Amino acid sequence: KNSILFKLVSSAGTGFFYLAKRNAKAEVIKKLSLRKFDPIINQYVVFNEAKLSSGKN
Amino acid sequence: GRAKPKVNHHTPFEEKDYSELKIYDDERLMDKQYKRIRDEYQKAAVKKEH
Amino acid sequence: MRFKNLSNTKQVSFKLRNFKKTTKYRLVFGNSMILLYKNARFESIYFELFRKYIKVISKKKNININYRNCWIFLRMNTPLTKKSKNSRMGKGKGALYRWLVRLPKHYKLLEFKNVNYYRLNFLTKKWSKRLSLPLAFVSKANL
Amino acid sequence: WNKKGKVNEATVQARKEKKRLKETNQFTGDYTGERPPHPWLSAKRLRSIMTQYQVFANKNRLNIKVDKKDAVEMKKQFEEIGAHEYYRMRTEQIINEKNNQVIDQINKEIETLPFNIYEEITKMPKDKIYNFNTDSNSPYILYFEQIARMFDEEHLTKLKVSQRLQKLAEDKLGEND
RNA sequence: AGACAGUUUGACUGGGGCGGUCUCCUCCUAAAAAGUAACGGAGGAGUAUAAUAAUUUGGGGUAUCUUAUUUUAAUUGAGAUCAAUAUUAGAAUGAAUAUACUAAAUUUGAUUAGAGUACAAACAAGUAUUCUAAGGAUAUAUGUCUGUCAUAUUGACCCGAUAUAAUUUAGUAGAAAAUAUAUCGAUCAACGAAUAAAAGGUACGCUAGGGAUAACAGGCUUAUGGGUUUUGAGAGUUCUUAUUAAUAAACCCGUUUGGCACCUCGAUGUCGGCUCAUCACAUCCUGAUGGUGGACAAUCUAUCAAGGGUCCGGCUGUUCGCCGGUUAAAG
RNA sequence: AAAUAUUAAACCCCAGUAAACGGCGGCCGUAACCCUGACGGUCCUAAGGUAGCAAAAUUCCUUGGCGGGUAAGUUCCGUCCU
RNA sequence: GAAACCUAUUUAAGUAGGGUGUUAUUUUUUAUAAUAAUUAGGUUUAAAUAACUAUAUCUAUAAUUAAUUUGUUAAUUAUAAAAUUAGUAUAUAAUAAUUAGUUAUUAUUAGAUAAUAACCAGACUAUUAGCGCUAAGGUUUAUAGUCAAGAGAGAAACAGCUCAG
Numbered sequence A: 001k002n003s004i005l006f007k008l009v010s011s012a013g014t015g016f017f018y019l020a021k022r023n024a025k026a027e028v029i030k031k032l033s034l035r036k037f038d039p040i041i042n043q044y045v046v047f048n049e050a051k052l053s054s055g056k057n
Numbered sequence B: 001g002r003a004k005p006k007v008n009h010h011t012p013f014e015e016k017d018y019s020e021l022k023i024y025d026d027e028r029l030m031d032k033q034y035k036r037i038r039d040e041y042q043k044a045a046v047k048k049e050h
Numbered sequence C: 001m002r003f004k005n006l007s008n009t010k011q012v013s014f015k016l017r018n019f020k021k022t023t024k025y026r027l028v029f030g031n032s033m034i035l036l037y038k039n040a041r042f043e044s045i046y047f048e049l050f051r052k053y054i055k056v057i058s059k060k061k062n063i064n065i066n067y068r069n070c071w072i073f074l075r076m077n078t079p080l081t082k083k084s085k086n087s088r089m090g091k092g093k094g095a096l097y098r099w100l101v102r103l104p105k106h107y108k109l110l111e112f113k114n115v116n117y118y119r120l121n122f123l124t125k126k127w128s129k130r131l132s133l134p135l136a137f138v139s140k141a142n143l
Numbered sequence D: 001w002n003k004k005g006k007v008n009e010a011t012v013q014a015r016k017e018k019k020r021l022k023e024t025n026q027f028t029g030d031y032t033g034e035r036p037p038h039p040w041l042s043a044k045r046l047r048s049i050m051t052q053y054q055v056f057a058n059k060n061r062l063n064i065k066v067d068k069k070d071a072v073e074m075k076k077q078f079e080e081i082g083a084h085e086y087y088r089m090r091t092e093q094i095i096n097e098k099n100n101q102v103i104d105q106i107n108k109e110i111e112t113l114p115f116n117i118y119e120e121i122t123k124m125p126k127d128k129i130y131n132f133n134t135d136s137n138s139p140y141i142l143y144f145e146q147i148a149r150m151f152d153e154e155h156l157t158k159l160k161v162s163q164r165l166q167k168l169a170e171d172k173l174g175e176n177d
Numbered sequence E: 001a002g003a004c005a006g007u008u009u010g011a012c013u014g015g016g017g018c019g020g021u022c023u024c025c026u027c028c029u030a031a032a033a034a035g036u037a038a039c040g041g042a043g044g045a046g047u048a049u050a051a052u053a054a055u056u057u058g059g060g061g062u063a064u065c066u067u068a069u070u071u072u073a074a075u076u077g078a079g080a081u082c083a084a085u086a087u088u089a090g091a092a093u094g095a096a097u098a099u100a101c102u103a104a105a106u107u108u109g110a111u112u113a114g115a116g117u118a119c120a121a122a123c124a125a126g127u128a129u130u131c132u133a134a135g136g137a138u139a140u141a142u143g144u145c146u147g148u149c150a151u152a153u154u155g156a157c158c159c160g161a162u163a164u165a166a167u168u169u170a171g172u173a174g175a176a177a178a179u180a181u182a183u184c185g186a187u188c189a190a191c192g193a194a195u196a197a198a199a200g201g202u203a204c205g206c207u208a209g210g211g212a213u214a215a216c217a218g219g220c221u222u223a224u225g226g227g228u229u230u231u232g233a234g235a236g237u238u239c240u241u242a243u244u245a246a247u248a249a250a251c252c253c254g255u256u257u258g259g260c261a262c263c264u265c266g267a268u269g270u271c272g273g274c275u276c277a278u279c280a281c282a283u284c285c286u287g288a289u290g291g292u293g294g295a296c297a298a299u300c301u302a303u304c305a306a307g308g309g310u311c312c313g314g315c316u317g318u319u320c321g322c323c324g325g326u327u328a329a330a331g
Numbered sequence F: 001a002a003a004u005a006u007u008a009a010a011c012c013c014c015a016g017u018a019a020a021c022g023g024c025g026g027c028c029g030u031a032a033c034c035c036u037g038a039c040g041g042u043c044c045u046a047a048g049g050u051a052g053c054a055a056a057a058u059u060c061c062u063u064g065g066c067g068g069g070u071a072a073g074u075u076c077c078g079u080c081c082u
Numbered sequence G: 001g002a003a004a005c006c007u008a009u010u011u012a013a014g015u016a017g018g019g020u021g022u023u024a025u026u027u028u029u030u031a032u033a034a035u036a037a038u039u040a041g042g043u044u045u046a047a048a049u050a051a052c053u054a055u056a057u058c059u060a061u062a063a064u065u066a067a068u069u070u071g072u073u074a075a076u077u078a079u080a081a082a083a084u085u086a087g088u089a090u091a092u093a094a095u096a097a098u099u100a101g102u103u104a105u106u107a108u109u110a111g112a113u114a115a116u117a118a119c120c121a122g123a124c125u126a127u128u129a130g131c132g133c134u135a136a137g138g139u140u141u142a143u144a145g146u147c148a149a150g151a152g153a154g155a156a157a158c159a160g161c162u163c164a165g
């Protein structure tokens, strides 16, 4: 398989987020960060990369 | 690019006549056993429409 | 079948339960010819039996000809698979034991250029008696 | 009667080798057959170039402003300096026309020759037509002591001198000077 | 601690079992609408990717061949040629050439919400996208963009979980907890998934059903098998047909090995031997005759012919078969 | 409410047990002839079927080969050993 | 007055929904058949040939080899343009009839909705294909018809063929 997920969180403390993929075996230096829409604010803001959980049992 | 425009050599009465000769041959290669059973009723109607 | 990779690939072709075709015969290269007169599965041994007897006609010692006598265009087309003896039906298709040529009705088996009219009529009659097929011989003379 | 042409494997590999090599580079080092340069150049002297060329690429119109007073004078200066030059430049355009006519007259007449010499002139060796070597007569040499003193600055002469050591380092025309 | 117990121990299938398969994609089959099965033929999928995506801009049109060039080509110039090739992320088909390939500048539309039609379609599921609103990119925009040329690139519901645009009543107020918007976890691959949780033997065997389903036998078929007929490689002193016969070919028979699974599954059957028989002729002897490389004899071959006849014994469970001995012959 | 520290039998590791079960090799070349292989190497194994018997109630090819008995014996006796 | 078809199923002799049947209701045709016009298609056609497998010829121009009959004689090669032929399940630029969709006309008489049952083992023949000895009353699909659920007359006698309902 060789893929991993991660969620993109807002600079604001809304907790809204999107998803994305990257391969596990790469050696990326640059974490992602993008300008996207937080409907809670009705405005674009800078999103940044973060960790995603998993399912336990 | 061998392609060159098509030609209707054969006149129309050939292709009619060619389709007819194509039957007279295949009718000769038949089995006689199939041929009389076909030709036993297939005649009678003609004598019975006439 | 598939002509791409003949030897490499394993080949299968549908038996054609009723296949009939007629192709209007006409001479192109030469004067006289032999032509088939019935749809048929033309084997190879139907040719190799009377292969020498054509060489004795078309080719002779100490005689040189520039142009060409015979034009052949025969190639194999049908694998003709089969099952073993004690095998039930189903469980796949049979395996090979031969190859053949499926020919149409009016097929130029041979095309000749200035070859003895008197021998080919003596040949094709014996040809057709071994094979029990209807075959014909044609020359530009009679036409 | 002509049919389509099939592909050569040469065009195949070039299409593929690039994609292997867009990431990598062929210029980086002795991967390419590369001799080292004239040893007058040094690791520190390239950094002297890089560190200051890094500065020049980072310049823009927004790192800089200019006073209008400096600007308005810059018109009349470079306008009239150019006006003298348009007079100069447009002469060369007129000059080169008449020069090329002279070439056209003779090329008509070169046909009007005997068989022997007409071969050579058409079939000259390119080595003779390919002479781009310098001479004692070069207007950078002939006028060097004059031109060294006519400028307003030594720097603008240093623009020339440092320029040559590069070109001398390229063609390897400098050695242990 | 099978010491003891309660239970499971898939299905399809040309009998069943062993083996193989079980979902999804593309063509042939498929018979010019769509659809169309089979343990029919073949190949593939369980991904990739933050640039391989979005808007603008530039470049040679690509490809095949020849040739010349300050020996150089971002992708040089010229000429001819190409039932659209080159390619278009991977299988196959289909299509595009404003494709595709390549260089570059700005950038995240691979954003949020709500209404609705059409195709397809048992159901559920799946598909394409216009219209309305907010908030952005591109930059003449006048306009274009709601992931990739397309089709596969996966999984229901329950339970549970992290972040949260919203609400709350087990007396009241809070905690707890439930639900809601966004979202994550399965080769549950027997892929509509019966459970979180599952293998075998029965020659000690039982019951209910079935000729819906097998072994002997009948019936259909006759590749195979046996025999007739035509042709005649090659032997026969010469010489195709005294004798012999490869190969190729046209029909017959229903005695072998088998294919199918129509009758019988609601008391029976298997080979062999004793006794008892009957029929065919494609005849082993006897009887008639032609031919002969037939001197006589003995013999070989073919035709007509079913009147009567056609062995005992040793070994073996044995038909058969080898052996001993015989006979007009031991069909 | 959660976590760390303390620890029993049992399980793992280790040891023992073969009139318990169970298991018991191959390759290369070598001697006045190929073949034969005492021997010598070669690789591996926990160890390499030792004694003895052997077409057996154990043998697929098999009515195995030779001999005995019988006018003649797929069974029987004796005997050899993939 | 049917069905033995599709789709799912620890399901295959079971069951469920669609489809077909009956009844009832309604100022009720979204219908069936026949004729004609009309649209796309890419089986078939084909002295067609783009592809694959194989293949027969022609030629400007530019050259070769041997020999003392080297101011001759003789034998030969390559090539732009031109250019043939056969075959195929998974080959077609192009291109039939019929079927199918829509519209109109005529004629029949149903359609829609609701309440609800049975069926979901099929057989043969004609045409057509796939496995099979293009063998089988064989086996699996498609388009009609008949048995099924249907007597009478003809096929010597005959569930499936003809006439007929």
Ligand SMILES: [Mg+2]
Residues within 6 Å of the ligand: none
């Ligand atoms: Mg138990």
Ligand SMILES: [Mg+2]
Residues within 6 Å of the ligand: none
């Ligand atoms: Mg237990």
Ligand SMILES: [Mg+2]
Residues within 6 Å of the ligand: none
């Ligand atoms: Mg119970």
Ligand SMILES: [Mg+2]
Residues within 6 Å of the ligand: none
């Ligand atoms: Mg079963």
Ligand SMILES: [Mg+2]
Residues within 6 Å of the ligand: none
């Ligand atoms: Mg079976």
Ligand SMILES: [Mg+2]
Residues within 6 Å of the ligand: none
């Ligand atoms: Mg169709």
Ligand SMILES: [Mg+2]
Residues within 6 Å of the ligand: E031
């Ligand atoms: Mg067809």
Ligand SMILES: [Mg+2]
Residues within 6 Å of the ligand: E037
């Ligand atoms: Mg079906």
Ligand SMILES: [Mg+2]
Residues within 6 Å of the ligand: none
């Ligand atoms: Mg697979």
Ligand SMILES: [Mg+2]
Residues within 6 Å of the ligand: none
């Ligand atoms: Mg692309």
Ligand SMILES: [Mg+2]
Residues within 6 Å of the ligand: none
């Ligand atoms: Mg462009």
Ligand SMILES: [Mg+2]
Residues within 6 Å of the ligand: none
């Ligand atoms: Mg060009």
Ligand SMILES: [Mg+2]
Residues within 6 Å of the ligand: none
């Ligand atoms: Mg793709």
Ligand SMILES: [Mg+2]
Residues within 6 Å of the ligand: none
């Ligand atoms: Mg492709």
Ligand SMILES: [Mg+2]
Residues within 6 Å of the ligand: none
């Ligand atoms: Mg999204």
Ligand SMILES: [Mg+2]
Residues within 6 Å of the ligand: none
């Ligand atoms: Mg519809």
